[PDB]
Design a protein around this ligand. Structure first.
Ligand code: A1AN2
Length: 169
């Protein structure tokens, strides 16, 4: 079965959300596209990106280093399409702004705009966690920006509950 997402709550006609680890979702669903919460040099050193790379047994990091060698770093708000390895057909590496490192929160709209080149995506909540954006604001930017079908996996039940309550106000 293709893109067999299960147990998501539909927020709008094109945005769904689940309390889940994106890595476990990707292994089960094998979506057409999994989004990585990348940085501009595609160094998957921790957090979501480190977890996705570990699930590929470091194949994602080797492929990422070869992309950077030929093409140079991404821009904040930009993306590139690379292999999905065992997690998906493709991985869309998207760079959201890291507010904790002084990057402009307005670039979060540009970051989500990359999703619109793909019909169906499994994605994390961009710029949340240690990137420092307000996660309720990130969900609002996602809902207002993404027009294709996005399945958000948020690996924290406390945050999931706050996000759903924030949406349903
Ligand atoms: C807001 C968080 C709950 C959310 N976390 C997550 N959301 C979804 N699937 C996840 N798997 C893991 C995980 C981590 N480590 C191991 N070993 N396995 C899986 C984390 C996780 C999240 C959302 C976006 C960002 C981050 C974190 S970050 O990594 O701090 C910086 C980049 C942007």
């Amino acid at each position: 079965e293709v893109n067999s997402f299960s147990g998501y709550l539909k927020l709008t006609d094109n945005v769904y959300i689940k309390n889940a680890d994106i890595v476990e979702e990707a292994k089960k669903v094998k979506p057409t596209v999994v989004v990585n919460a990348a940085n501009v040099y595609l160094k998957h050193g921790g957090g979501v990106a480190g977890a996705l790379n570990k699930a590929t047994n470091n194949a994602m990091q080797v492929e990422s280093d070869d992309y950077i060698a030929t093409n140079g770093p991404l821009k904040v708000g930009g993306s590139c399409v690379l292999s999905g390895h065992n997690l998906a057909k493709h991985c869309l590496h998207v760079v959201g702004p890291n507010v904790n490192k002084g990057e402009d929160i307005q670039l979060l709209k540009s970051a989500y705009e990359n999703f619109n080149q793909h019909e169906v995506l499994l994605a994390p909540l961009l710029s949340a966690g240690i990137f420092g954006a307000d996660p309720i604001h990130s969900l609002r930017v996602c809902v207002d920006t993404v027009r294709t079908n996005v399945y958000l996996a948020v690996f924290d039940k406390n945050l999931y509950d706050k996000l759903v309550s924030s949406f349903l106000e």
